[PDB]
Design a protein around this nucleic acid. Structure first.
Ligand SMILES: [Mg+2]
Ligand SMILES: [Mg+2]
Ligand SMILES: [Mg+2]
Ligand SMILES: [Mg+2]
Ligand SMILES: [Mg+2]
Ligand SMILES: [Mg+2]
Ligand SMILES: [Mg+2]
Ligand SMILES: [Mg+2]
Ligand SMILES: [Mg+2]
Lengths: 132, 62, 185, 57
RNA sequence: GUUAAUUCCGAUAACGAACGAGACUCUGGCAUGCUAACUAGUUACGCGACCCCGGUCGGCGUAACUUCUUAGAGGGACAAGUGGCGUUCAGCCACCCGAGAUUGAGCAAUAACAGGUCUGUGAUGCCCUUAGAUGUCCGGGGCUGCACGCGCGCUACACUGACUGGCUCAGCGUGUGCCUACCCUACGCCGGCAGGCGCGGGUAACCCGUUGAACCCCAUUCGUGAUGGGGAUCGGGGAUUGCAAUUAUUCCCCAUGAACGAGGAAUUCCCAGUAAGUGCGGGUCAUAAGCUUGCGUUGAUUAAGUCCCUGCCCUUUGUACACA
């Protein structure tokens, strides 16, 4: 089995986390890049780390990777969190109102409103799942 | 009981006590619509012809 | 002869394999026929690389057995060559075609095994292997303690197996295994 | 591995001490461990968005 | 789920870790590229010898170079590229390029055996003996004894073989000693042989040595007969080692010529340069390989799976066992 160990995988994740701009698709380029940036004592471990770097870069080019903190993907995530639309979906011209909700709003202070719409009650009381 | 040829279309798995028999789906090259499952001794790859002495027997699928 | 290949003095072509079940597993025609049945090796590395080995090389390899003869491949190349000479001087046909017909006739189509024994039809590569083993065993049994030499015995066993006259030990063991498998099914 | 001769018998002592790594090689060996991957920290660089020049000499 | 692996992916009252595995070292292969070479050579020349311009020479000497030689720094292989399977993660199979797409060993965790060693020790507790000695030295014998059974091995049962000639190829290696008295041997004569007599070389890429090893190849003799298979037993003689060979130390010659016709129940080892055949070195060695440890030649059958037997590792279950 050609299974990479944790000393390969965690070190490769640290290398890609610190030097995402330097690394690339080509194995013989980013192998020498990892040789320059990282102090690896042996060529076999260096080749394992470089191969797992190439595989994680293929995973990054395919999509997002869970156990990594890329600055560009973090900026994209922050942008998608800070995205604000134009008009709110809570502001509606017609709001569907059930009759018991209309009764409790009538017993509250806000009985009559401007933009509500009392609908007909759903006749036929069949809401539970059949057993077994 | 005539002799019929059958081509291997899908190997399923190892059967037998010592694991010496391949469970093999075979398509008959005479009637291509009919296909059966038999146990086969020997090294079996996909895409080769066995010479079945009878087509009526069938191995039990586990 | 740069285009067509000559197995010694024998032609590569005009070798008709009768059974289409044994077409890919008999490597004799147009790619695998060489000048000698000797070779370097590597055929036992992968599982189905043994099928790509030529059948005369497989007979050459299976002939050397029983302690005193392990690792005499030049010697059994000499045996197979003189046996092909005797096959031509008796039958008057292609020794390669006689050997292919001997494999087809001597290979048992079924066997029985423990799944009480139940009968199952064998793989064609296993059938080629069983035929190569049985005719070699019959030739060695005929050659042991006899004036008749190993080349004469191997030639007579291949000719009797291609004929199917039930005088060959390989044909007899093939009929015995087929009859036992016909019984216990 | 040493021996000590007590009155009742003889006791063996095994002392195994792993030496730490050093660049100089005085307190320990010079070669680092085969499992320790020493990864340096990247220097803080600022990417320029405006092309400029540094013509001198 | 995956892996040779508690190897990883992922879940998660766990987080952070540690040994082991892996990683590491040596070995094997690929680099017509770098460094190297009168203790390795290469190819060109100059001669010499022989055959009819050309061919051979490990016959001689020198001109650049390292392909063959050796050993140093590097490099190269990582599931990297492609096509599929797979939570599209961990990973798996096949294929292209390619010397390799699992070479082999060493090291090897916690805990334990009342496993072996007091006959390895001037490692040792306790007990025994200590002068008519269980200390030490010398002579002889024994450790080899033979109605019997077992184990590891060698020789074979032959014609796929034996004998007799001819051809033709290796790599591990080792080699003149503190005491230490004992090395590997070329070459020339004597003898059939074991061996003996003299000059030399070698502390070793210098000399043995281009290590002219066997199996194998070629050509006669044999003819299925316990035969020219097999060489046990035994008689007569001749040499080496040593103070001393008788219970034959070993080796050589002639002769004597047994069982054994492929082996019952039972059972061992193994899947690639592997098993097996086959020979060569080291250790024991004054004399010495049927053992062991390494190396080389020829070199396959079948398998790329399984828990059926023998066992091992996880989870669950039950226990009236815990020297289990
Ligand atoms: Mg014979
Ligand atoms: Mg004890
Ligand atoms: Mg004495
Ligand atoms: Mg003894
Ligand atoms: Mg016995
Ligand atoms: Mg004899
Ligand atoms: Mg005799
Ligand atoms: Mg011994
Ligand atoms: Mg119970």
């Amino acid at each position: 089995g050609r299974v990479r160990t944790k000393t390969v995988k965690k070190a490769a994740r640290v290398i890609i986390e610190k030097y995402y701009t330097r690394l690339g698709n080509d194995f013989h380029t980013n192998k020498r890049v990892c040789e320059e940036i990282a102090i690896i004592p042996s060529k076999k471990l260096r080749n394992k780390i470089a191969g797992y770097v190439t595989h994680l870069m293929k995973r990054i080019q395919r999509g997002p990777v869970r156990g990594i903190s890329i600055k560009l993907q973090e900026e994209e995530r922050e942008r998608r969190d800070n995205y604000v639309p134009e008009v709110s979906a809570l502001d509606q011209e017609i709001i569907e109102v059930d009759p018991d909700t209309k009764e409790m709003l009538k017993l509250l202070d806000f009985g009559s409103l401007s933009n509500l719409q009392v609908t007909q009650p759903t006749v036929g009381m069949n809401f539970k799942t059949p057993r077994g | 009981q005539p002799i019929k040829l059958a081509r291997v279309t899908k190997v399923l798995g190892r059967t037998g006590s010592q694991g010496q028999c391949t469970q093999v789906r075979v398509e008959f090259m005479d009637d291509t619509s009919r296909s059966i499952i038999r146990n086969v001794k020997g090294p079996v790859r996909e895409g080769d012809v066995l010479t079945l002495l009878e087509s009526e027997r069938e191995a039990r699928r586990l | 002869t740069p285009d067509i290949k000559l197995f010694g003095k024998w032609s590569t072509d005009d070798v008709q394999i009768n059974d289409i079940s044994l077409q890919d597993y008999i490597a004799v025609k147009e790619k695998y026929a060489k000048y000698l049945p000797h070779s370097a090796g590597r055929y036992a590395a992968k599982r189905f690389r043994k099928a790509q080995c030529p059948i005369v090389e497989r007979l050459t390899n299976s002939m050397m057995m029983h302690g005193r003869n392990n690792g005499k491949k030049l010697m059994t190349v000499r045996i197979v060559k003189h046996a092909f000479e005797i096959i031509h001087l008796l039958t008057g046909e292609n020794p390669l075609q006689v050997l292919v017909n001997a494999i087809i006739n001597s290979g048992p189509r079924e066997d029985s095994t423990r799944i009480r024994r139940q009968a199952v039809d064998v793989s064609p590569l296993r059938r080629v292997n069983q035929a190569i083993w049985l005719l070699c065993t019959g030739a060695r049994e005929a050659a042991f303690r006899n004036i008749k030499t190993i080349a004469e015995c191997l030639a007579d066993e291949l000719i009797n197996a291609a004929k199917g006259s039930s005088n060959s030990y390989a044909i007899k063991k093939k009929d015995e295994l087929e009859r036992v498998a016909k019984s216990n099914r | 591995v040493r021996h000590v001769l007590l009155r009742q018998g003889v006791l063996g002592i095994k002392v195994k001490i792993m030496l730490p790594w050093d660049p100089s090689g005085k307190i320990g060996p010079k070669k680092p461990l085969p499992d320790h991957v020493s990864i340096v920290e990247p220097k803080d660089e600022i990417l320029p968005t405006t092309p400029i020049s540094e013509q001198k000499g």
